[model samples]
Target chain A: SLLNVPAGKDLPEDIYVVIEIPANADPIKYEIDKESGALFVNRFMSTAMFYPCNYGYINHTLSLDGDPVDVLVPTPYPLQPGSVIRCRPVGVLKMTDEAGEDAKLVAVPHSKLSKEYDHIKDVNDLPELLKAQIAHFFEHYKDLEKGKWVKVEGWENAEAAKAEIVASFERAKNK
Target chain B: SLLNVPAGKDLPEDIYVVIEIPANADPIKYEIDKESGALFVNRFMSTAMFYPCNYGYINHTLSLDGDPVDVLVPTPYPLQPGSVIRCRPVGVLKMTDEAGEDAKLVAVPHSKLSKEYDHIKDVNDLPELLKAQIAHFFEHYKDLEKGKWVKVEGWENAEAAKAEIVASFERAKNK
Candidate 1:
């Protein structure tokens, strides 16, 4: 099962991510049924906007949100849902939702699969427009749902993101 | 001057667009000083988001907003502000701001300069995620501004966009 899979040999710089929702698809929220190790639909997105990137989680890691560490992998095309891929965390979006700390780590493919994004060594290298869009998505994705509030504290550098990954991995190990 | 230049020989399918703001830049709104044709800073974006696409207007055209018809040309790289380029309108974002019908036409490069997007023949050809990001930007760009509300009426096909362009061009000619 994916939950039993090792996070990675390279720690935060290169880790495994499990795709829950592919990029460019409808925002039907999905989550893994941890007990069954099966994917289940959480709910349809209340808003009209779609997922701006590949939404997923890091294996063998737990976050403050009480789920696997959330990660967003940006690519020119959509990745297959439930597929596991290796990626490098570039930065973190410091966000807080009704559920508590719901920050999402932004990552790029670990391999040179996308020539267009090969030069993005850090979050600062990402296009300003893309950064804005990702922030906007997190800030307002729950706008249509009643009683849900989201506050975006802003972004952190790659080092901070890596640190979070390490802490989450340790937490999962303790669990 | 761009104001004196004809909209385009091929009508809406191909037209000249004068860049006012390039993609991925800070959201410092800029407008042309109509009397001198010089670009002037309008205001900094009240929100934290940046412009998601190359923003400008069609030459020799006027719309209900009392300015040159606005157009957003998406490209992989930033285009120079105040420079005119040819593009093909693929669709329109039917939006209404506090000032009233402030729709923006969505276009792609007319030349093969962007081989990545050359396959896009209509708004539907654009990625669903890209479409969502554009809509999200227009809907919430004025969130922090006082008494400024933006309503996104959704998207229109290429034909409707072309029709709007033709009407705006005629209005400019009459003016």
Candidate 2:
């Protein structure tokens, strides 16, 4: 979410939004209606990317006994003053026999539906995780670039030049 | 986790665990080694309902970069004195490719993962929003129920005749 600003601060300012839909149901295509500022759901959403400039969250949980499904929509930025968004659901989610087959609805990230299950719960945890993953990825890459630095006892000729090893170690450590 | 007990106190006993596997993954199976008390990951688990008998909160995040998955292997009772429980890994996550003529993954309830994505982050916002939704679902259901109740208005005593109507009003107010 962003801080308050007066209207018309800039011309053609860029905005990013996440349009999350309900999970594992019939696919839908959408038509953006500029005049009405609404998104009408239509047919299949076969392998597509939802960029930030458009789209909105659609709330449709096809749950029976209890709320088995829920769509949560959050913007990295707060809604601008007078800003409006509308979502028109298209395809339908057929009720599945909870007793049939695998039996549970698993929500996958970076996949369709349940994209509605976006980040909020884990935003704070991302940074620490990214740090560890990046370091792991980096350590391997450093060795690939520098060649195996196995310390050979008294092998003076094969030893890394003292200055070279020290400087490169510092660089690698910094990275 | 608990505190130290008096010298004469006994160790806690009965415990159960619910181990959840990710979507695209099978339920976990274990072969208990009676003598060693070893729990080995049995063969692959495509269908099994692992029950969670114990309840508690974990103070960390478990990250799965490949497929979104979480398994809660709850222990029915806390470990005995000088004993501990261990999890080698939470099984594997099986992912599906969307483009294969048929989407390979099946629908399943990996509530653990969804909770990981929704449950741990913030504590304050869950209730009010959830109320708004229960209200939403109750709205539609209440209408259908009251509509049916009105049809039977002829069968009610004068005082009890309007009971269903009043109940209908109660649900409507929430919506």
Candidate 3:
């Protein structure tokens, strides 16, 4: 029932993340209260454009926004909601939005492979144009909501990416 | 403003169709009343997948379901609601749900192009599997509404497809 994963429990480098497709045909993101285990929709933003990648988060780890640490799984096919995927953190997309320190963990799925990417070791390993497109999605996704991303510094190393996760895990002091 | 195009009013063999992405963040079927000029959500089926093509209806026409003739616009990108797209009827997907006589007009956009369908001269122009996939969508889209499509016999040709459109246009006796 823990919404955020057990605070800073030892985890493998490649951890399982749950994917929630944002397209209307898909279910909206659901959140679980760590204390009571109550589940609810956190936010709903309607848009015509589909998410370019499988979007989700590592449960039990809180981010700066007090939500689970967000993760992006790049794959040709979609994984359903509650689909837990094992992935290795290859890089992180660092961005600051109106809410501050908003970052996305960019990882390669351990079990899937597409022509575009097999396994990425670092953010720089990803194509520049592809990286740019990811940044563009984040920048404009909340445009109507009056949310603005200050910057998108791409391709931080795996060590740095894991550190961010740990920081989020530690930040979940209570409720 | 008119939500539906006037019936049988000089529409081209290739006509502009409007798309209404459903409330569920996917393309849904909508019906506009000609008499009251009231636009209402026609069929509401909660599904967890996106429409492979932009699903919409031809304006000013009535189908067996007492709604506008539906269309499946195959485009590479997503479209906003009320977006009018010019397309040529390539074929007709003849189907019958529990209510009877539900046919969808299969067309290729005149203004858009993807590798699969730039312009469909006839039903044969599309891949067999793709056509089958489209049929499957209609058959199962409204399963929970107790809706069941009886059959799907494809490839009616352009002439036949256009003829169906005209017939629907003329049948709008009231709303």
Best by DockQ: 1
Q: Could you give me the TM-score of model 1 versus the true structure? A: 0.56
Identify the candidate with maximal lDDT.
1
- Give the alpha carbon lDDT tens digit for every residue of A1-175 in model 2: 1112111112112111223332122224344333454555654422111111222321211123322121112233333322333211111112223232111111112213233424422323223432232222212212212233221111111012222222332443244
lDDT of 1 by residue, B1-175 (tens): 7556568759978898888998767557988777878889998775545566899998788886778888998887888888887888889999777877767899888874556667888888988867877787778877766799989998888998899999998998898
Q: At residue A102, what lDDT does model 2 achieve?
A: 13
Clashing pairs in 3: A4-A60, A5-A59, A5-A60, A5-A61, A24-B24, A24-B25
Clashes of 2: 16
Instruction: Please tell me which model should have the higher TM-score, number 1 or number 3.
Output: 1
Give the per-residue Cα lDDT of candidate 1 at A138. Answer: 72
Residue-level lDDT tens digits of model 2 in B85-131? 23212211122222221101111112332333223122232233322
lDDT for position A139 in model 1: 77
- TM-score for all models, in order of appearance: 0.56, 0.17, 0.47
Q: Where's the lowest-lDDT run of ten residues in candidate 2 chain B?
A: B5-14
lDDT (CA) per prediction: 0.81, 0.24, 0.64
Model 3 segments more than 4 A misplaced = A1-175, B4-12, B22-44, B111-119, B147-150, B173-175
Give the docking tier of candidate 3.
incorrect
